[PDB]
């Protein structure tokens, strides 16, 4: 008996291959950058494993059912799709996208029966539960019925009130579960997400030793968010003619003040890979940590519980 | 605590103030009293160690009584430096009120503990000083090993650096609130000091010594009239001496007693220890993560006709100092070394040349503690930088005075008037002349004096 | 009309000043750096403010008059109390301590009279309201009795009804008061909070350009965790040794691998002030994260509720 390893760690490193197979490494050079590195053991000794492998022949999809614990059939399958029909890279960049996709869903069911679970039930029935309470100190209260109604029109005359509940615990639900003219102006930028990895993938191409313009020119193709690219393309032209990097960098508000000075560091002392990898952990762990998500709930927790009170109160 | 019954203390005048090595420490009064003494020998069964104290004080002691000081140590609206002592005291005062309600005034220990040469040498070992007159000494104060730690630590901090096993020694100053100064060295645990923890202080003691120090012997007044001169059209000077020659001293007291009012005058310090009676000034103190020259590039940068540099040790400094020099500034600094090519090599080896240096460096001077038994002694012993020479051995040194140990005297050593000649003409040449043999011990009185 | 500002907000900036007054730093000095190391701008804007009045020689509890609306007469005669008797660096600690109580208290009451006693009054009596109301729905329910019984021997019976509500109380009172050998091994060592406070002090102190060796010389007298105090004061030894910076924090479990790694970098970058600052940004948003404070309090208050329902049926 053998398991996986977690939706983080199958992450970063299906990401960082896919990242450098599409950047034109050798696939056994590909492997020996993300084993070397690896942060956990059990990641670098694997991914070692599955270099040994690769380098006496066998396919990527044949190297990896040395560890179908880690790699499912599903996973292979499409790594071997990939390589039978010329699409390796484009397959480890959905699979990628998929392991971003599984670790992210997993963070944030699990996030908060445990306490999350707990926690949902307890928020999602607070307020109509209070709401119910008022409503039931007595009769003739704002809205209601005298009792000697027939029961069907007291229950319909109150389907306002059943209405003003059940509104209430969709909004509770909606968010628990998102959460976990200026035309320009509107369109999605660069996210953390997206630093994160394009911090991650350079790391990761540095440390493998391509140069800086290589791997900019790999990643300008590789961003997803376009914007981004379009900033990636802008920083890569200007360093290209000669800028340096911290100075392109310095031209957009996605790198902070401490990015640019870091960076800015490492051209001075050729340990830019270095500086990269660990901006990128920064990045990442400050990712999975990730405000906003907490106080736009409360803003519709009591802001729906004060709607139904004032609601039959008219 | 502990005696034998209330009364027999006050009876005799004697207290019991503590316990160590198997011994009882008595204050007594009357320690002539075999009697008194051989009764408390047999009614404690313990060894005594006898302290006198004035009679009034042990009366005072008994009636009174570590633990009133156990409780305002959790105070530390007391220990802040930030306040002024005179409000800080206040507090101890009141807060002690909490026992007995009244104020007592002057807790001696409350305060003791709250607000020329000490060596500490170990662990229980008895202190020895440097008295003005009786010079080595032995002394009765001892700490043992924890006592000793303390000591140190509030040295060490009062001093601003932090003692540890990681950073066992420590060469500081404590700033006296009377301005005053003192030299602390400083070692935690053994490492370092086998015989324990240790400490040494050499007292300044300061409000800066003047010109009238040619009562001390130390330099003659011809020789401060030289200088007087030198430094009113601004050469360049530098005192070098050995450790506690009397280098700060002696430059505090060159630009002391000039009349300074007139020009712009500009001090770069890693602590102050420059008191000046001038108006145009402005006084420069490294804090945190400063370089001493991030102050002097930024302060040259100015229009500073006098620029002194408390002591150069980052060369990194030294040479933005001897920049200012050929600019033409008037520099001003103080630099640890004992002869010519300890300073040379010391000023060398963070890469000024001694052209810049020696170049636009115009007069250095060597100060020295010189010992006879029981005096001491801080001597001016002796140096005119004439410049550079190309294919050389550099450095061209003319020396004005020697100092003479035997005789104690200060004598001219092929110093002619033609050589302090270098004047940019007649009547600044006759100025300095008449100050040569033309040109009250307070320092404000002293500068107030130089001023007319 | 004007309000004051968040109880996260003051917290920060009381903490901020505090700690770099009792470093002894001059006043003004002090204002225009925790002024220059906020993130929202009324903060920035008010302090520069607040500094402006003491460099024209006001006293702190006089400039901060100019703000009544954020600094109440409380905290200004505590300020001023201070500055008249020689301790402004031990009240501005203890307004430190004010503040991050306050703070605590109010996410803590809040999570699933001001507020928290409009709310805390609301949650005590709402059940045992729920509770009076059901029972009061007619005669002859479970466990009554019949009106005509004498009123003693009525009130009697229903004892536990009574209870069961008192209880009720007692329980949403204690969720509402709690919430808002080997010696060695049962000390209360570092937590996350003291982690937080230290990594803000010395962000605070290195921004403002204190140097590394006189941030730590203050900090490790304005610690409140004794066995913190004793490591700062090993970490400060080791550095006025000659030891690297990050070397002595990595003798010491509290500091992760993460934080040793990129304060690792700030010493090889000059950029240790910012590393710093974004360390302490993350830790006071993963404390104030730190949620277990509100499902345990829901446990108890529908379990009560229910608890007292089913007492009088059976």
């Given at each position: 008996?053998?398991?996986?390893?977690?939706?983080?760690?199958?992450?970063?490193?299906?990401?960082?291959?896919?990242?450098?197979?599409?950047?034109?490494?050798?696939?056994?050079?590909?492997?020996?950058?993300?084993?070397?590195?690896?942060?956990?053991?059990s990641?670098?000794?694997?991914?070692?494993?599955?270099?040994?492998?690769?380098?006496?022949?066998?396919?990527?999809?044949?190297?990896?059912?040395?560890?179908?614990?880690?790699f499912?059939?599903?996973?292979?399958?499409?790594?071997?799709?990939?390589?039978?029909?010329?699409?390796?890279?484009?397959?480890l960049?959905?699979?990628?996208?998929?392991?971003?996709?599984?670790?992210?869903?997993?963070?944030?069911?699990?996030?908060?029966?445990?306490?999350?679970?707990?926690?949902?039930?307890?928020?999602?029935?607070?307020?109509?539960?209070?709401?119910?309470?008022?409503?039931?100190?007595?009769?003739?209260?704002?809205?209601?019925?005298?009792?000697?109604?027939?029961?069907?029109?007291?229950?319909?005359?109150?389907?306002?009130?059943?209405?003003?509940?059940?509104?209430?615990?969709?909004?509770?639900?909606?968010?628990?579960?998102?959460?976990?003219?200026?035309?320009?102006?509107?369109?999605?930028?660069?996210?953390?997400?997206?630093?994160?990895?394009?911090?991650?993938?350079?790391?990761?191409?540095?440390?493998?030793?391509?140069?800086?313009?290589?791997a900019?020119?790999?990643?300008?193709?590789?961003?997803?968010?376009?914007?981004?690219?379009?900033?990636?393309?802008?920083?890569?032209?200007?360093?290209?003619?000669?800028?340096?990097?911290?100075?392109?960098?310095?031209?957009?508000?996605?790198?902070?003040?401490?990015?640019?000075?870091?960076?800015?560091?490492?051209?001075?002392?050729?340990?830019?890979?270095?500086?990269?990898?660990?901006?990128?952990?920064?990045?990442?762990?400050?990712?999975?940590?990730?405000?906003?998500?907490?106080?736009?709930?409360?803003?519709?927790?009591?802001?729906?519980?004060?709607?139904?009170?004032?609601?039959?109160?008219? | 605590?502990?005696?034998?019954?209330?009364?027999?203390?006050?009876?005799?005048?004697?207290?019991?103030?503590?316990?160590?090595?198997?011994?009882?420490?008595?204050?007594?009064c009357?320690?002539?009293?075999?009697?008194?003494?051989?009764?408390?020998?047999?009614?404690?069964g313990?060894?005594?160690?006898?302290?006198?104290?004035?009679?009034?004080?042990?009366?005072?002691?008994?009636?009174?009584?570590?633990?009133?000081?156990?409780?305002?140590?959790?105070?530390?609206?007391?220990?802040?430096?930030?306040?002024?002592k005179?409000?800080?005291?206040?507090?101890?005062?009141?807060?002690?009120?909490?026992?007995?309600?009244?104020?007592?005034?002057?807790?001696?220990?409350?305060?003791?503990d709250?607000?020329?040469?000490?060596?500490?040498?170990?662990?229980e070992?008895?202190?020895?000083?440097?008295?003005?007159?009786?010079?080595?000494?032995?002394?009765?104060?001892?700490?043992?090993?924890?006592?000793?730690?303390?000591?140190?630590?509030?040295?060490?901090?009062?001093?601003?650096?932090?003692?540890?096993?990681?950073?066992?020694?420590?060469?500081?100053?404590?700033?006296?609130?009377?301005g005053?100064?003192?030299?602390?060295?400083?070692?935690?645990?053994?490492?370092?000091t086998?015989?324990?923890?240790?400490?040494?202080?050499?007292?300044?003691?300061?409000?800066?010594?003047?010109?009238?120090?040619?009562?001390?012997?130390?330099?003659?007044?011809?020789?401060?009239?030289?200088?007087?001169?030198?430094?009113?059209?601004?050469?360049?000077?530098?005192?070098?001496?050995?450790?506690?020659?009397?280098?700060?001293?002696?430059?505090?007291s060159?630009?002391?007693?000039?009349?300074?009012?007139?020009?712009?005058?500009?001090?770069?310090?890693?602590?102050?220890?420059?008191?000046?009676a001038?108006?145009?000034?402005?006084?420069?103190?490294?804090?945190?993560?400063?370089?001493?020259?991030?102050?002097?590039?930024?302060?040259?940068?100015?229009?500073?006709d006098?620029?002194?540099?408390?002591?150069?040790?980052?060369?990194?400094?030294?040479?933005?100092?001897?920049?200012?020099?050929?600019?033409?500034?008037?520099?001003?600094?103080?630099?640890?070394?004992?002869?010519?090519?300890?300073?040379?090599?010391?000023?060398?080896?963070?890469?000024?040349?001694?052209?810049?240096?020696?170049?636009?460096?115009?007069?250095?001077?060597?100060?020295?503690?010189?010992?006879?038994?029981?005096?001491?002694?801080?001597?001016?012993?002796?140096?005119?930088?004439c410049?550079?020479?190309?294919?050389?051995?550099?450095?061209?040194?003319?020396?004005?005075?020697?100092?003479?140990?035997?005789?104690?005297?200060?004598v001219?050593?092929?110093?002619?008037?033609?050589?302090?000649?270098?004047?940019?003409?007649?009547?600044?040449?006759?100025?300095?002349r008449?100050?040569?043999?033309?040109?009250?011990?307070?320092?404000?009185e002293?500068?107030?004096?130089?001023?007319?």
């Amino acid at each position: 008996g053998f398991g996986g390893v977690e939706g983080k760690d199958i992450l970063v490193f299906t990401r960082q291959f896919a990242t450098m197979i599409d950047a034109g490494l050798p696939l056994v050079q590909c492997l020996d950058i993300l084993a070397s590195q690896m942060d956990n053991p059990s990641f670098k000794k694997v991914l070692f494993a599955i270099k040994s492998k690769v380098e006496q022949g066998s396919t990527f999809a044949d190297a990896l059912k040395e560890h179908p614990k880690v790699f499912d059939e599903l996973y292979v399958q499409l790594c071997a799709a990939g390589e039978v029909g010329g699409i390796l890279d484009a397959i480890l960049n959905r699979l990628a996208a998929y392991r971003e996709k599984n670790e992210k869903l997993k963070s944030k069911v699990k996030s908060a029966l445990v306490a999350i679970g707990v926690t949902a039930v307890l928020l999602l029935k607070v307020t109509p539960v209070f709401e119910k309470m008022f409503a039931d100190f007595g009769s003739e209260l704002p809205g209601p019925t005298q009792m000697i109604v027939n029961f069907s029109h007291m229950a319909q005359e109150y389907f306002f009130h059943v209405a003003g509940s059940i509104v209430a615990v969709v909004m509770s639900f909606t968010w628990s579960y998102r959460q976990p003219l200026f035309m320009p102006v509107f369109g999605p930028v660069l996210r953390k997400v997206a630093v994160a990895r394009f911090t991650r993938t350079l790391g990761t191409m540095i440390s493998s030793g391509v140069p800086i313009l290589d791997a900019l020119d790999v990643t300008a193709k590789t961003a997803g968010n376009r914007t981004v690219e379009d900033a990636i393309i802008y920083v890569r032209g200007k360093i290209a003619e000669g800028k340096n990097i911290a100075g392109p960098l310095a031209e957009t508000k996605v790198f902070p003040s401490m990015v640019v000075q870091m960076i800015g560091v490492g051209e001075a002392t050729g340990a830019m890979d270095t500086m990269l990898n660990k901006i990128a952990d920064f990045y990442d762990d400050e990712v999975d940590a990730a405000a906003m998500i907490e106080p736009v709930l409360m803003v519709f927790l009591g802001g729906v519980v004060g709607g139904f009170l004032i609601g039959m109160y008219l | 605590i502990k005696l034998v019954p209330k009364e027999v203390a006050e009876k005799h005048l004697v207290v019991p103030v503590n316990r160590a090595g198997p011994s009882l420490i008595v204050a007594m009064c009357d320690p002539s009293n075999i009697f008194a003494v051989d009764d408390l020998k047999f009614l404690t069964g313990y060894n005594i160690e006898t302290v006198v104290a004035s009679e009034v004080s042990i009366r005072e002691a008994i009636e009174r009584y570590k633990g009133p000081s156990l409780e305002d140590i959790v105070g530390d609206v007391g220990d802040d430096i930030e306040v002024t002592k005179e409000e800080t005291e206040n507090i101890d005062e009141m807060a002690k009120a909490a026992d007995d309600a009244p104020v007592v005034k002057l807790v001696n220990l409350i305060l003791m503990d709250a607000i020329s040469d000490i060596h500490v040498e170990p662990y229980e070992k008895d202190f020895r000083v440097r008295f003005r007159i009786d010079g080595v000494m032995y002394e009765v104060m001892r700490p043992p090993m924890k006592l000793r730690n303390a000591i140190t630590s509030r040295l060490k901090i009062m001093a601003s650096l932090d003692i540890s096993e990681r950073r066992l020694p420590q060469d500081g100053r404590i700033k006296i609130k009377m301005g005053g100064g003192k030299e602390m060295d400083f070692r935690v645990s053994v490492c370092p000091t086998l015989f324990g923890e240790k400490v040494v202080m050499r007292l300044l003691d300061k409000s800066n010594l003047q010109l009238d120090m040619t009562k001390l012997g130390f330099d003659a007044q011809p020789l401060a009239w030289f200088k007087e001169a030198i430094d009113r059209p601004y050469g360049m000077v530098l005192v070098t001496g050995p450790t506690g020659s009397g280098k700060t001293t002696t430059l505090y007291s060159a630009l002391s007693s000039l009349n300074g009012l007139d020009t712009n005058i500009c001090t770069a310090e890693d602590p102050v220890e420059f008191n000046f009676a001038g108006i145009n000034q402005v006084q420069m103190h490294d804090d945190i993560g400063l370089n001493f020259a991030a102050a002097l590039r930024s302060f040259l940068r100015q229009d500073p006709d006098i620029i002194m540099i408390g002591e150069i040790r980052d060369f990194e400094t030294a040479e933005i100092g001897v920049k200012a020099a050929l600019t033409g500034h008037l520099v001003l600094s103080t630099l640890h070394t004992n002869d010519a090519p300890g300073t040379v090599s010391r000023l060398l080896n963070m890469g000024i040349e001694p052209f810049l240096v020696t170049a636009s460096l115009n007069l250095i001077l060597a100060q020295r503690l010189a010992r006879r038994l029981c005096p001491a002694c801080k001597k001016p012993a002796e140096c005119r930088d004439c410049n550079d020479r190309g294919y050389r051995g550099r450095v061209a040194i003319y020396e004005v005075m020697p100092f003479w140990d035997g005789l104690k005297e200060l004598v001219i050593n092929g110093a002619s008037a033609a050589e302090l000649k270098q004047e940019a003409i007649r009547l600044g040449m006759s100025s300095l002349r008449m100050s040569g043999l033309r040109k009250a011990t307070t320092l404000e009185e002293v500068v107030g004096n130089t001023a007319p």
